[PDB]
Amino acid sequence: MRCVGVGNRDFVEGLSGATWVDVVLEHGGCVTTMAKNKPTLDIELQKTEATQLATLRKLCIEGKITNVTTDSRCPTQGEAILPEEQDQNYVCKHTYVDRGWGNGCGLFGKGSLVTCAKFQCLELIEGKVVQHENLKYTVIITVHTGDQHQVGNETQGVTAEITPQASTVEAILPEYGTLGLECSPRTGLDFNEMILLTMKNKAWMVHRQWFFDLPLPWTSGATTETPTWNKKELLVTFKNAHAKKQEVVVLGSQEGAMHTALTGATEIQTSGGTSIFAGHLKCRLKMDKLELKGMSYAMCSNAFVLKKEVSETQHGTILIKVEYKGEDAPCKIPFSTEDGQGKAHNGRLITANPVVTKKEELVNIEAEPPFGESNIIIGIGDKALRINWYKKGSSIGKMFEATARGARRMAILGDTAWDFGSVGGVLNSLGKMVHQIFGSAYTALFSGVSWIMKIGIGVLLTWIGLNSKNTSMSFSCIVIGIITLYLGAVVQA
């Protein structure tokens, strides 16, 4: 939705051939696609919502206990039995207590005792898996037209629905042609192995095999009037006291403990129909049909005026707000970036065709300036408005920043990050394959390791590598330890 200053905009430039670029869309941040002689676009995945949810298992968190019973036997006579043990509603445990002539038993010793009490859960947690083919990926696509109001405006764009039923969708941009989206909704987040529990008005996305390993009593989740709770012994606690009688009490509301146990699990919106944020999509952008607006217009013959001071985005990109004081309203904005002490055209536009649409309307021109001091000219002739700017940093700075950004992208996305901005490529595909193999091998080893334990194992691996005489083993241990330290320091985003 035309995000500028989001800090995660991830510029993507270039086209492989047949005019398409492969990009990966994530909830946090955009992608900015600026090809030659095509309108630039600031695309992102806005929200993913599951239309219909199937409840698979429902644990419970609170519990009320009623109808406490108790049967006892003399020591030698064996195990005590209540008729209500076979009732699935009741939960109970056998204990051994001492009996005697004061307890009514004729023979001294330790006698068996079982005390069965009713059980029902006041509140429940309601895990409900998502069918992977009832999703709805909503990609919002702005046009980056240089309008007056859209600088960071999050309500302006074109909406395209991406579902596994109809993945390829041509989003008709207004006056810019029809962009072609060939997407892959089936390879995002693997919702098959996720359960998406709901708690109470606060849902979360949880990995499938963990919700099956919660020490809470479950149900079938069959929307039945009277449920049959399994493993009810987890809530109710049976205290044998001084080994003379057994008393049963409920352990209490597990809401806080469950909230604690959900740390590291991405949250999710559940207002109205569920809407899954914090997801990624792999839409491939086919820009065959994207035309420009003003390719048929003329050049402006009059001057420009700055209406808001220029500012630098976190990614080094300047933004310019000019107003055209001239009579030929449909026009083009001449834009040359004069370098310091030389007229070298080193800075390039990020708005494909800076166009003034009306005399009254303002226009936002986005442009990447050179890393040095660089003037910028917005007009024609000697009365041309000249913006002076000093972008700070070095090209080595951008290289380091891009390397760190790509390392993070590979950390969250994994093998899929190799396909971000990947215009075709054959070496890139081989890198993706080898990364797939190594990432699967690493994920098998380091699954379920903590924030700090990953760093500890990485330090241990590095120390082992430094002190390994075998050159191959030493190099392997050092290399894997460094990346383990990185993953430990970036995990739990």
């Binding site: 390993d213 049976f238 205290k239 044998n240 001084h242 080994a243 080893l445 379920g448 334990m453 390994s468």
Partner: protein, 75 residues
């Protein structure tokens, strides 16, 4: 959280059964076993780390057991 610091190992020991003695006696062992059986891949990594640090078999076993216990519990 609160549950991460149970009132166990303190100096107050009496005859009467403590609160959830039977249930709380084996919860740590049970969670370690569940994590280990749900992440079998880490077993070979723990073996690898123990084998390249334990000169003797006793040190290998001690380091392997400690790594097996610590990682699920730090989770």
């Amino acid at each position: 959280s609160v549950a991460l610091a149970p009132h166990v190992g303190m100096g107050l020991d009496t005859r009467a059964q403590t609160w959830m003695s039977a249930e709380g006696a084996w919860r740590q062992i049970e969670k370690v076993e569940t994590w280990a059986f749900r992440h079998p891949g880490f077993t070979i990594l723990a073996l690898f780390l123990a084998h390249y640090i334990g000169t003797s078999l006793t040190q290998k076993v001690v380091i392997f057991i400690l790594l097996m216990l610590v990682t699920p519990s730090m989770t």
